[PDB]
From a paper:
We also determined the crystal structure of the cytosolic domain of [name] in complex with ATP at 3.0 Å resolution. The overall structure of the cytosolic domain is essentially identical to that in the full-length [name] structure in complex with ATP, with an RMSD value of 0.9 Å for 230 Cα atoms. Since the cytosolic domain structure was solved at a higher resolution, we describe the ATP binding by [name] mainly based on the structure of the cytosolic domain of [name] in complex with ATP. ATP molecules are located proximal to the subunit interface between the N domain in one subunit and the CBS domain in the neighboring subunit. While we observed the binding of [name]+ ions to the cytosolic domain, as reported in the previous [name] structures, the phosphate groups of ATP are 5.4 Å away from the closest [name]+ ion in the ATP-bound structure. Therefore, ATP binding to [name] may not be directly coupled with [name]+ binding. The ATP molecule is exclusively recognized by the CBS domain. The adenine base of ATP is stabilized by three hydrogen bonds with the side chain of Asn203, and the main-chain carbonyl and amino groups of Val207, together with a π stacking interaction with Phe227. The ribose moiety of ATP forms two hydrogen bonds with the side chain of Asp188, while the α- and β-phosphates of ATP interact with the side chains of Tyr170 and Arg187, respectively. The phosphate groups of ATP adopt the extended conformation, and thus the three phosphate groups are exposed to the subunit interface between the N and CBS domains.
Numbering used by the authors:
A (entry chain D), B (entry chain B), D (entry chain A): 5 to 252
C (entry chain C): 6 to 252
Write the structure that this text describes.
């Protein structure tokens, strides 16, 4: 299959190339990523579907992340940057700023105003603490909602959430008050209020919490996702376990 | 023509395309503007000579104005920003802050100090009043100047003036005192003083004045340009009829 | 002229420094592009800062920008701090036309007040009064007596653009009268300014066109002209040398 | 030796000088600092390796700090600002703000967002209290970690830590609960938990504590570092004695 794109690569006509790419897996593209030359990398990135383009970008080394964000054509930029999970977006920009603070500024200029807001908050954190690892794309609900309401909410919180298997519950002020699983929603009666299904003794993590402490906590409680809070006890993000394996 | 453009786009060769853009009229490009795909618009705006690029921009909707002031490359920005007439520059910046005040701020930073000085003044007026429509790029002279001197002045005022067919006359304090046309000047004797050709009975409009009042007034007296004064009677700008036709 | 080149052959600081300290800026200005990067670099290396600045104020905007990029940064703040504010603005503008990043850097090098001062001037049209004026004039109050004004002028002199014309403002700084150095000298040392000053002052607005400044300058046969803002406050003076230079 | 430096300045030739700068100690450079003229200091700062360049800046008077942050070329600025310890960077930026608030602002723009985040936090505290002296670059751990885990932890905490000879202990909420020394970790069993080596009897100082008290307290208990907490008991920084010796 590596030759299969190169077959399509050499073919010069995109149409053959576009049908392989739409079924190539990111990781299988990631593996063969560095036997590819500038013109190749350029064209595959010219119209690799934006979800996949973004996905590959996230798994490259910071050096190559920066290189690729100076490679792709600018009409493609806002797409890819807007497709990135915010955690991955921050990492990408930090990678960029390390070599080119000017371009870092340029990139952020491209963002939708809310997205820039979001990333700018995340970027303020130490890359190797919870904040530097978290993403704000989680599902939060309040105590009074019933299970039915929570499900209807999750099915449109779904397009953009990092994960929906864990639903966090905060109050009026947005401070953490409980945690609930998708599995829990399912076993329970649709009009059960969340307040008796939620677990009130939530294990949480601070934005300055060291990543290996996050890793230990994750291995101890055997959770794949962990909530992150600010000084006021407010849920500000979640750290997913995949992003913790990557610190090894 | 239309085919002349699309051919050049697909060929990828900037030869055919710079050849098309340097002779295409902005309005013919504006007409086909939303038969264009993201990469196309980028490329036309990357290589359309700056005066036309600015021309198109002024005729896009505020929404696309904001968007394309974000797609274009930064070296192109300061050009387009400096190439806009000050009324249109103000409009464009307003369109941007409506969506993205962060980027609104970064843009103004790109402006030269005179332009930021100038634009910030206009930005202070209500967009549907005389100030929201005026430009400071008008030509003013004193009553004592001779037709010969006024004419020599026009030839170095022209590059930047909105219009030079009407010449406005102010005093020591710069408050409005008279008006004369380029035609009155040509009909007149080269050593004739302005104070004797000018019309002292000038119809003016205040920054306060609602845009439709600018329209009724423009239509009655059949002027294509109308002067704006402040509360102390000082000329601060002129409103031309084209910007008033565009109020529909 | 070769007297320069002999100093070149010397390779010597002193041999070159001795001619540079007695060369007139205009005589340096004439042969300036009989000089190569190597020459201009070294002449600028230790040419006395006042003169260095003087030459700079008189180069074409393209070469000014170049000149501000050749000299070593320890010399930059010197030369920049020596420029009259009118000339400093013009120099930075020249730079920004080609390189806005460097324009930003230069301004970073300024003393905070000089930056403030230049930044005000930079907002004006290069060909209107504000673009031509310099804020380095002498202002006094109406109640001062002649001796007091002279005292001021003797320490106002080092930095003032000119001291031959003294302008009179009030508590809030609106123009009140104009006075000459000559008037001060013919006059009695305890005479108050308010009886010697001329109250009907001819002024120019910051948006006033430069050729109107030239006419006014030629009509009233003045060499310096005061510039005011919209509130009637003296904000600068335009000297006639800078108006001849528009021709 | 010391005189060998002036040789290289006079050499005009860079290589002779880079050899000197590469082995001169900051203090030996600081000693001779104002027998130097502008052209020299510039060149010494043009070519002095960034840790040393930052070291010298840090021991200069606030006035020369402010000055030399203006003489150095901007490509060096971002280096030196990022190379400073956070306590010193906060001190240096204040030195600049006292003379030139405009430039004070531009510098902060050069800062990386986490660095700006951190420094802005330190800037809020009074220069003559614990906050004005502390640095957040300390190492904190949990009670449950073993001696083994911490020792592994310190080997990736050290590069940025002010000091690692004292390791501090906080809880779920990050409030101070205990202290232990690096020697305590080394003597102890690799499987021993921190909660059993740590001294729960911690001597602390709040952010508003006057410097003289930090000195009084440091001299009594014969400590070289002292922890700082907020009003809710959360560890926010450490004060080292070298910054207390330099209060004279
Ligand atoms: N951050 C958290 N803090 C506290 N409890 C949590 C947190 N995240 C999830 N939980 C709890 O963990 C459980 C979710 O586990 P899941 O439903 O995946 O089943 P599991 O891993 O097989 O274990 P079990 O079936 O025993 O719950 C729920 O009880 C949920 O309340
Ligand atoms: N805003 C204004 N207020 C008052 N008077 C004006 C204004 N604008 C123009 N005028 C006067 O009206 C006249 C219109 O002159 P213009 O150059 O438009 O000639 P025209 O319309 O081609 O010929 P005509 O005016 O004789 O029909 C000008 O000479 C000017 O003096
Ligand atoms: N900008 C100005 N506006 C109005 N009056 C001025 C201005 N500048 C100078 N004057 C006045 O005009 C006169 C010029 O005197 P100056 O020092 O030029 O000697 P002069 O050329 O012989 O003039 P005079 O013959 O009038 O004395 C002085 O009285 C001065 O106060
Ligand atoms: N800030 C502090 N507050 C309270 N206790 C502290 C603090 N810092 C250190 N300690 C305790 O004081 C002890 C002294 O530290 P350290 O081991 O460096 O001492 P030492 O001089 O090497 O040997 P000794 O402790 O025998 O004098 C540490 O073991 C630690 O438990
Ligand atoms: Mg990260
Ligand atoms: Mg993730
Ligand atoms: Mg408008
Ligand atoms: Mg217009
Ligand atoms: Mg000027
Ligand atoms: Mg001058
Ligand atoms: Mg401090
Ligand atoms: Mg310290």
């Amino acid at each position: 299959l590596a030759v299969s794109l190169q077959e399509a690569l050499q073919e010069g006509d995109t149409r053959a190339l576009r049908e392989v790419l739409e079924e190539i897996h990111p990781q299988d593209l990631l593996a063969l990523w560095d036997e590819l030359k500038g013109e190749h990398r350029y064209v595959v990135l010219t119209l690799l579907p934006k979800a996949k383009a973004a996905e590959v970008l996230s798994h490259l080394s910071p050096e190559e992340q920066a290189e690729y964000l100076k490679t792709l054509p600018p009409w493609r930029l806002r797409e890819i940057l807007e497709e990135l999970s915010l955690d991955d977006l921050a990492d990408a920009l930090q990678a960029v700023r390390k070599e080119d603070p000017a371009y870092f500024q340029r990139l952020k200029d491209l963002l939708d105003p809310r997205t820039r807001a979001e990333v700018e908050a995340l970027a303020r954190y130490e890359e190797d603490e919870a904040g530097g690892l978290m993403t704000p794309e989680y599902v939060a609900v309040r105590e009074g909602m019933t299970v039915e309401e929570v499900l209807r909410f999750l099915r449109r919180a779904a397009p953009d959430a990092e994960t929906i298997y864990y639903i966090y519950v905060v109050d009026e002020k947005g401070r953490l008050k409980g945690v609930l699983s998708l599995r829990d929603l399912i076993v329970a009666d649709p009009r059960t209020r969340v307040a008796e299904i939620m677990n009130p003794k939530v294990v949480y993590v601070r934005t300055d919490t060291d990543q290996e402490e996050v890793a230990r906590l994750m291995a101890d409680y055997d959770f794949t996702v962990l909530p992150v809070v600010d000084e006021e006890g407010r849920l500000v993000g979640i750290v997913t376990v995949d992003d913790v394996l990557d610190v090894l």
